[PDB]
Design an enzyme around this catalytic site. Structure first.
Site, PDB file in Angstrom:
ATOM      1  N   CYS A  33      -5.025  -0.216  -0.243  1.00 14.08           N
ATOM      2  CA  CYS A  33      -5.386   1.160   0.084  1.00 14.08           C
ATOM      3  C   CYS A  33      -4.739   2.126  -0.913  1.00 14.08           C
ATOM      4  O   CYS A  33      -3.508   2.234  -0.990  1.00 14.08           O
ATOM      5  CB  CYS A  33      -4.982   1.447   1.530  1.00 14.08           C
ATOM      6  SG  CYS A  33      -4.755   3.157   2.035  1.00 14.08           S
ATOM      7  N   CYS A  36      -2.620   4.880   0.563  1.00 12.54           N
ATOM      8  CA  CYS A  36      -1.404   4.277   1.104  1.00 12.54           C
ATOM      9  C   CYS A  36      -0.375   4.049   0.008  1.00 12.54           C
ATOM     10  O   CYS A  36       0.812   4.344   0.188  1.00 12.54           O
ATOM     11  CB  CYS A  36      -1.723   2.953   1.801  1.00 12.54           C
ATOM     12  SG  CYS A  36      -2.968   3.037   3.082  1.00 12.54           S
TER      13      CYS A  36
END
Length: 108
Positions: A33, A36
């Site tokens: 991600c 992230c």
């Protein structure tokens, strides 16, 4: 020189007992991600800065499907603020370090 982990990895086994007492920030993330990975260094810095004052934790949604389902994670990053085992705020996206600090301090 390995990577250092100031954060607490949360799992189905240790989740409840880890956040039962005190202030915790829980970052739901995954290794694939992009946002992230953009948020990760802020969580490292907070974990170090708040060592001994608050529990800065991470839940890898690839490895902890039951935990993410427990909190209805449909998007990551998801940041969860808990106090004394109860969820207080649930935020989505690449939250700023300043906003996270202030929310931590308010709970502290």
């Amino acid at each position: 020189h390995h990577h250092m982990s100031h954060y607490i990895e949360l799992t189905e086994e240790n989740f409840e007992s880890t956040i039962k007492k005190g202030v915790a920030l829980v970052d739901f993330w995954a290794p694939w991600c992009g946002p992230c990975k953009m948020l990760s260094p802020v969580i490292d810095e907070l974990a170090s800065e708040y060592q001994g004052k608050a529990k800065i934790c991470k839940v890898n949604t690839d490895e902890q499907e039951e935990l993410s389902a427990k909190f209805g994670i449909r998007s990551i990053p998801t940041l969860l603020f808990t106090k004394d085992g109860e969820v207080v705020h649930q935020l989505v996206g690449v939250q700023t370090k300043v906003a996270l600090k202030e929310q931590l301090n308010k709970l502290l």
